[PDB]
Symmetry: C2
Subunit: 107 residues, 2 copies
Amino acid sequence: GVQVETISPGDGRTFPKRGQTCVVHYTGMLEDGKKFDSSRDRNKPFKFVLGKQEVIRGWEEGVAQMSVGQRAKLTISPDYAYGATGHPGIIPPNATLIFDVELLKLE
Amino acid sequence: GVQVETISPGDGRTFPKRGQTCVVHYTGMLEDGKKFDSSRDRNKPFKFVLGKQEVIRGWEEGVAQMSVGQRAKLTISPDYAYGATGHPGIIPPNATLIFDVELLKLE
């Protein structure tokens, strides 16, 4: 699945709707803590229309449970992220993935 | 599977061994011709140790059938590349992928 632990409460009231642009700052790491991508690094918020499948299902499904402002810890299982093939050279096969994700705003 | 059509014969005699560094210039496109990554663009040959799983199985298995110098057309089926999840925002699900690949040298 994806599972969501909170690290920061967000306004507790605004939650993403299908079609909205989620603006986020994330860090991605391997189940062993090993980091693999971060928008933080790049100093660039990342943005994706919710609903459009342009981000992994664990993100579609977990960021939709977050209120504006929230910082949360997402654990995503392979079936909800990159499956059995993985993404060679970045994500190995059947990797459970931990994302540290912060919802900055909706458009 | 991967399937390999030739576009240029290579020396016909040197074939990659496990452990060797393959240096390649490729272009990747979607089964509809739509381009999605190219080392050519970047003017940078790409290099990967054969055998190490750091490139998709269709490449492990198809570039190993190429002699130094050869330019070949690789069609790779989802199971041999990015499976059913794909790589959201780049490769959609169950995509058959066409690579235009040229083997420049071995290290």
